[PDB]
Design a protein around this ligand. Structure first.
Ligand SMILES: CCCCCCCCCCCCCC(=O)O
Ligand SMILES: *C(=O)CCCCCCCCCCCCC
Lengths: 91, 91
């Protein structure tokens, strides 16, 4: 399998359950944009990471480095909001 | 001055616009509930407040104060998430 969208539908489905139980809703295309950004910046996360603060704080650091190095317009507008909400959910 | 449903449609319309531009969407019912909660804890905000980080931080303190006195179970589950997104917008 060499699909470009591996894990995408699972990620979207999980993201959408976690966010919807806090009253927030992301468009599918936007959820997919975020996922592609996450696996670009932090490909180790699905493989070795968990839904805990240490790992999610690391994903944050790595996304921030990416912004600093590439400018805040190669980044999806929804990346910081979604990251932030997941951080809080993990708290 | 706040009073029942007064200001509610306008508050909701601005809130939805601000959130939506960041790729986060709230149901109208959740936004109404968030408004009723804000005006309960911080009725000064429409009257004397401004849409700035300092006043929003006060609103934040007052919502946590309300949680402390009445317990986590009394407050809408979307309250903290919405407040947090608006705080980022204001940064
Ligand atoms: C045209 C966009 C305006 C959006 C913000 C306007 C806020 C209206 C002022 C609030 C009036 C509150 C009076 C009391 O409290
Ligand atoms: C998903 O599409 C998995 C694809 C795996 C293809 C493997 C083919 C390997 C061909 C080279 C073999 C050389 C060793 C005999």
């Amino acid at each position: 399998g060499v699909s470009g969208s591996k894990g995408q539908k699972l990620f979207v489905s999980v993201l959408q359950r976690l966010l919807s139980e806090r009253g927030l809703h992301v468009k599918e295309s936007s959820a997919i944009e975020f996922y592609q950004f996450l696996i670009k910046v932090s490909p180790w996360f699905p493989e070795e990471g968990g839904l805990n603060l240490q790992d999610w704080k690391r994903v944050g650091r790595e996304m921030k480095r990416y912004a600093a190095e590439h400018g805040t317009d190669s980044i999806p507008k929804q990346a910081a909001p979604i990251w932030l909400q997941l951080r809080e959910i993990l708290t």
